[PDB]
Structure formats: structure tokens, C-alpha cells
From a paper:
Being a unique natural fusion of an N-terminal methyltransferase (MTase) and a C-terminal RNA-dependent RNA polymerase (RdRP), the NS5 is the largest and most conserved protein encoded by flaviviruses. The NS5 MTase catalyzes the guanylyltransfer and both the guanine N7 and nucleoside 2′-O methylation steps in the capping process, and is a single-domain module adopting a common S-adenosyl-L-methionine (SAM)-dependent MTase fold. The RdRP module is the central molecular machine governing the viral genome replication, and has an encircled human right hand architecture with palm, fingers, and thumb domains surrounding the active site. In this work, we report two crystal forms of DENV2 NS5 that reveal two conformational states bearing clear analogies to those observed in the JEV-mode and DENV3-mode NS5 structures, respectively.
With an aim to further understand the conformational diversity of NS5 and related functional relevance, we crystallized and solved the structures of DENV2 NS5 in two different crystal forms at 3.1 Å (form 1) and 2.9 Å (form 2) resolution. Each structure has two NS5 molecules in the crystallographic asymmetric unit, and has the two molecules arranged in a dimer through pseudo two-fold symmetries with highly consistent global conformation (root mean square (RMS) deviation values for superimposable C-α atoms are 0.74 Å and 0.57 Å, respectively; chain A as the reference). The DENV2 form 1 conformation is clearly related to the JEV-mode conformation with the JEV interface partially opened through a pure 20° rotation along an axis passing the vicinity of the highly conserved GTR residues that were proposed to pivot the MTase movement relative to RdRP. The partial opening of the interface results in the reduction of the interface area to only about 900 Å2 or 59% of the JEV interface. Among the six conserved hydrophobic residues forming the interface core in the JEV structure, only three of them (DENV2 NS5 residues W121, F349, and P583) remained as part of the interface. However, the motif G region in the pinky finger is largely disordered as observed in the DENV3 structures. Based on these observations, we propose that the interactions between the MTase residues 113 and 115 and the phenylalanine (residue 465 in DENV2 NS5) in the tip of the RdRP ring finger are essential for maintaining the canonical folding of the ring and pinky fingers, and the folding of the motif G region in the pinky finger is likely dependent on the dynamics of the adjacent ring finger.
Author numbering: 8 to 406, 419 to 466, 468 to 600, 605 to 742, 747 to 885
The structure:
Amino acid sequence: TLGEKWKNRLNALGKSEFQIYKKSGIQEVDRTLAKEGIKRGETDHHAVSRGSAKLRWFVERNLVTPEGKVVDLGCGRGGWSYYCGGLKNVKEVKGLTKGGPGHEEPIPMSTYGWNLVRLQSGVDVFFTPPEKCDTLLCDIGESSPNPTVEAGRTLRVLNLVENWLNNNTQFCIKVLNPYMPSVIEKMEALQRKYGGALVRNPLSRNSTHEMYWVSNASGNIVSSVNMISRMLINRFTMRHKKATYEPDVDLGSGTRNIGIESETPNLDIIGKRIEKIKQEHETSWHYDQDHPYKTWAYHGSYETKQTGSASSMVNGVVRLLTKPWDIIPMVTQMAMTDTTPFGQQRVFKEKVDTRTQEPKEGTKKLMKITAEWLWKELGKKKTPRMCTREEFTRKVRSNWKSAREAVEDSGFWELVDKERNLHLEGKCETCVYNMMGKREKKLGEFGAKGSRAIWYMWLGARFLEFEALGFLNEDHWFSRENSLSGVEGEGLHKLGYILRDVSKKEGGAMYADDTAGWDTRITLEDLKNEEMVTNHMEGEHKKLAEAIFKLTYQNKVVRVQRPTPRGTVMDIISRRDQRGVTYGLNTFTNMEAQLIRQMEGEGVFKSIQHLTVTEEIAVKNWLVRVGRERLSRMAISGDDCVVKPLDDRFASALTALNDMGKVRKDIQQWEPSRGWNDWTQVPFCSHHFHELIMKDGRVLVVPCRNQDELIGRARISQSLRETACLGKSYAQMWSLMYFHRRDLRLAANAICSAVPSHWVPTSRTTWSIHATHEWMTTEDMLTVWNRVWIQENPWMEDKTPVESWEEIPYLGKREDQWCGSLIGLTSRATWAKNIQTAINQVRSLIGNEEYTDYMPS
Ligand SMILES: Nc1ncnc2c1ncn2[C@@H]1O[C@H](CSCC[C@H](N)C(=O)O)[C@@H](O)[C@H]1O
Ligand SMILES: [Zn+2]
Ligand SMILES: [Zn+2]
């Protein structure tokens, strides 16, 4: 028996002598002040565990000099990794923890260097292959009263780190149990090869023998272990000692890098307009030597009042009428988003900060030819033109503290005129985009969320843009009528009929692949293709639009805001690639892309790498012979697309689709696509569409979605009244659009029976483009219903009005139940029986006003 005569004493020791012993003589790190700011949401400075300190005392003693690629095996919250981010000779850190239920889930931190730390949870480091790394950490080992077990556990990790270890590598490896003649054997052998020594840390509790194989030490294995067994056996009878306290680690703030650079930015274009911003400022303009950008070009920063949020209020007025769903987690776990400068930069590091390799000479040709053709088609029966300051000032009606109060006020129009003749002449000055997150009610918390960005532009630079490319959305170029494929100017509810009318086409299945971050995947080839709108212009109309395309679309300057360790700045950056009117372009190129892909299925061309002469002829013929036939095969709204090709050879035609940028989401690249054989199953614009027979026998096609997605979004906002008029906007929307849901209607008739009548609905219910927002009136909702489905709905022939909500039909139960209903559950039944009661408690809380009652008897 080794000094493991101590484990015999330890685990066989009094429950309280245990918690005394554990702390006596050691070195603690008062955490009861960092653990307290992390719950507040404070994301700076703080270490996430008592482990930044641990790895601090080793690093500060030169026992480990992490550098370069650092891989952390067992990151947990992020103690060693986040700490290593702050360090200087480190470049990237890769964190890995099993995590999950029982284990320790990682924490996201704004701490200095954080952009250099990527943490992934859900990883059995034992089952993942080794990568190149300049330093290798590992803090795995669960202790146990059975030392034969943890010799096995330690043996298991020692075998792992040896796979990852290289002769030149820096390391730090928790040896959970080092006094067992199993590990001392393996350590003695691991030490001959890789060298280093076993070092006990003065920060570890006395209830373990943890020693660390640190690369840059040296020392006898056996004797260093018994040295610790003695020192730990002593403290069994050494009169309880306090616990020397260290200050925690101040892990800092802010983002480093400046090393890489990788975007030759035409300065002879973005130049005359970057000196503006550093003129406008300069009492602030610095150059952050620690900018995070790699595939965007950096230019300097300036001080900025922070802008964003990460809030989430429960619409407790919709929530008090939603009593059966307080348990369902895909409501009670759907936060708002995160627009704070940190969550914007956290999204930047992941979605916008990428590049896209150049397409192959042959893809390049196919994309030209097809656009060459499409543009020519799309305006077979259309002509481009300018849009009038009048039209713009006219468009002011919902779409200088104002924009209404900025166009009717002479000043702006001379400001837009100076830069106007500048574009004409070949420059911008005032043509920056100013990024910001889009608040959205995407779910994903724990108690979190984040996704998108919206390139907001100078209220006067839009005019130069609107004036050039406004004819697109204004003469309805991408309306189904003229584009055959587009669905512009079409009601979301009427988007169901358009898919039904496409199943009518003869072909394979219906396909609705989603592109992974479309705007980021726009290439210059897609930019210079969409530029061809100009070939079909002339005069002072080309020039202008040419400037738009060449000056602000292919060559744009952007500002974004990130937290420095000294306030929120606003960096200024430029990319040539990517895209910010970006709907018709996003529809134009999605068509072209889905044309090239349809073509691939059918074999009209065989290789992306080179299109042969006899092959770019077939392309033309195909395009001229069946081009309009295949446009009719698609339902395309921006980046969102539904397709029904000839055959299911489609679902494998990908050399083009992946070379153009347009890489599908949530699916390995060279894996065939998912077909839909039922068009009431295809998703398009975050909805699907059932076909619902009424009583008189008329065909309804009606939008639907996972009924949970609908309650959750409704129970969030960005007074009792300002929030009661937010439910009524959702409730009015559920009628009219989701009327076919036993749950939603029953819950909507309750919202409008607890929100006073005459109270007008307010703030957006959806940022959908195809949303008519027709649920905002204060009219009888059965009047509007007839107005949408019967009076104005074209696919509706018998204009015989309906005049009762009882004559309005639900889906069949099991569709309702499939698409997510709760009918059939004992709560849902209790919730309807006793509903005039939760109406009451919401009326008896929204004051004492005028109340109708819609609730059917
Ligand atoms: N097989 C495995 N693969 C990956 N992670 C594991 C693992 N087994 C345990 N872990 C995780 O590794 C962590 C080690 S304890 C975490 C401490 C952390 N390294 C720090 O510096 O603060 C545990 O949280 C556990 O969740
Ligand atoms: Zn300009
Ligand atoms: Zn449905």
C-alpha cells in the first residue's frame, strides 16, 4: 500500500471533519463576487471558475507557456480557455467539454481575447480525433472513494493526451490519481518521452491528490508524489488552518488579433469617404491594434454611445390567457435577441466574418449566360426608369429628427444633390452602411439568443439608391405575373395557393432547401451579374445606377460597434464581397441559381470546371426552349425557394450550387436533398399551408406552422396598456390567418375579450415581407375575414360572404394536433372550461373599461 493510506483515512472520515479538512491550510480564491456578477449578466473581467486562478499559478511560475493553437480538453465553463485567451503568445483556443445534463455547460464571456476562444459542448474528447496544436490542456478526472476506479479513469486520460501530444508541445494535464502503481508506471513512461514533471497546485482542496503533468517542469515522479501524500496526511492532525486567500483573476476586456489581414480593399473608391468619418470625429479616431476582423478590412474606430439590448419581457397579458403552455418549453424558452455591441460582435465573428472561394471558370459562364438571359426576359414587357423625389417624398408615408420632417425641408435635398453629382462624377462620401442587430423573437435561452444584422443606410443615400434601382420593387418586376417565379406583392396567406398551383406541374418532388446565411454568400460574380440591369438602361440613368452598383454595392464602407476595454467604440470596415432593393436582387440571383441547378439535374452541362462550346450552346437552347417553363416551376421570395423540377435527379445536382456560394444549411455538403411529396408539407416563408374545406365546399389554402412558434413569439415584447395592445395585435392576427386552430382562436377570442375594445392594435406582429398586417384595423374581424379570404381572394370563386365564426372551419383535429394543437389534453379542456375566469383577472388589471365578449357559448 502506497501513501493511499490517505484515501483510506479521507473518504472514511467524518462528514464535517471532511468539509473542515478540505479547506484547512490551502489557498482559496474568493469567488463570492465573480459568481455574483456573472448572474447579473456582467460578462467582463470575470473568470468563470476557480480554474482561471489554478492555471494562473502554473502559468505565472513558467511551468506551462501556452502558445499558438491551444486545445483545452474538458473546458467546462471555460476556466483555462478564457484565461488563456488573455495571454500573449496565444493565437487561437479550442474548447471542448462533454457537458450536457449532469455535466458543466460552457459560459459565453466578453473577457479579453474572447474572439480567440471558441467553446464547443457535447464532446466526448475520448472519441474525437487529434488536431495540430501548439499546446494541450486537460482537466478531466472525477474523484471517487474507490482508488482502483480512478486509477482507471486517470489511465484513460493519460492514454488520451498521449494521442494529442507531440515532441514540441506545451502541456498541462490533470493527473487525478497519481499515487497508484498504475499511473506512476504510466507517468514514469510518459515522462521519459515527453518530459516535464508532476506538480501539485496550492489551490486544490485537500480532498484530492490532483497533480499536474506540466511540460516545463522537471522532478522525480515517485518522490514528488509521496511528498504530497506526506503533506496531505499531515494536515489530518494539523489543527484546522484558515485558508490563505488570493484575489481572483481579472481576465480583462476586449478583443485582440491584428495579425492576418486578408481583404485588398480598393481604397481608390472607399477612400474619399473614409476621410469623412475621421474628419467628422478625430477627437476620438484611433487605430485599434486589436481589431477582430479577418475578412473585413479595418480602418480605425471612434467613441460611440452603446446601442442595443438583451431584454425579454413576458407579455403577461397573453401569458395569463396561455395558462396551459407555461409548461411547454418551446414557449417558456423563447427569448428576444441580443443587439448589445457584444452580441453583435459575437454574431459577426461567426456569420459575416467569412469568405467564399471564387467560382470556377465554367460556373462563372453559366451564371453570366443565365443572368444575361433572365435580365433580358424579366424586362421583356418592362422598362427601367428613375424614381422622382416626389415619389420618394411621397413614399415617406410609412416605409432632422424625422424622415417625413427631413424630405419636406430643403436642406436634405441639396445635401443629396452634392453627393448625387459626386456619384455621377465617380465618388461617394456619405454612402456608409451602419450595421445593427435585428431584434427578433428567436427562441434559445436557458434563462440567450442571437442571429441577424440589418445594414441601415443614410436616409439620403437610399434616395440615390431608390432613384436608380427603385423601378424594381415599384414597377413590380418580381411579381409572379412578370417573373413567373417571384411572389412579390403577394399576401402571406395567399402564398399557400401558389404552392398548390405548383404541385399541378408535372415533375418530381417539391424542394425547399435553405441557404446558410444567404447575404454573406453573395459573390462578386453575383454582384457583377446583377449589375447587368444596366445593359438595359441608358443616359443619366445608367451612370447613376452604375455608381450604386460599382460604388456602394461592390465597394461598401460599414460601421459596427464593439466594446473596447475603455468604452464602446464604433469600428469602420469595408468588404467588397457580400451584400447589404436587396430583395429583388436576392430574388434575381436565387432564380438564376435555381435555374443553374435545375439545369444540372437534367444534365444540360456536365462540369462546373469548364463549360464546353457545345455545352454553353445547350445552355442557351435550354434557356430559350424551356426557360420560362422552369421559372413556372419555382416559388421564390428572396433567398427562400421552393422548386419542383422534372425529375428527382435534382436532389444531387450540387457542384454548381456549392460553387456559387449558395451552400445549404444543416446538412453535409455532398448529401442529397430532402424531397417533399405533399405540398402541404413544404415550408416557404416560415409557414406551411393546409387545404381546408368549409361547409359550402370551397377550397381554402391557409397558412400554418408549429403552433408553439406562434404562442412563444406572442408572449414576448421589446405599461399594462402598451403590452395589452401588443397581444391584441397578435390576437387579431391569429384570427384572419390562423383561424383554423382550435387553440389559437379560442385564445384569441380571449385576448380581445380582455383587452378593452376601441384600443387600437400596435407595433409589428411580424417582420415578414409578405405580411399584409391587415389585422391592425379596429373593425369587426369577420368583416376583414370576408375581405381577405372571400371578397378579395382570387382563388376564391364563390364570393358568397360568410356571416358567423361558426360557419368558419378548423383544421381536422389530428392536423391541429400534428401542427401542434393541445386539444385532447386535460389541461387544454380545463383551460377552456374555466376561461372567463382568466379573462376576468386580466380585465381586473387592465383597469375598468368597455369590454365586448367574443367567447362562443
Ligand atoms: N470525456 C469527456 N470529454 C470532454 N469533457 C469531459 C469529459 N469528461 C468530463 N468532461 C468535462 O471536463 C470538465 C473538467 S472539470 C472542468 C474544469 C475546467 N477545465 C477549468 O479550467 O475550470 C468537466 O466539467 C466535465 O464536464
Ligand atoms: Zn455616395
Ligand atoms: Zn399546418
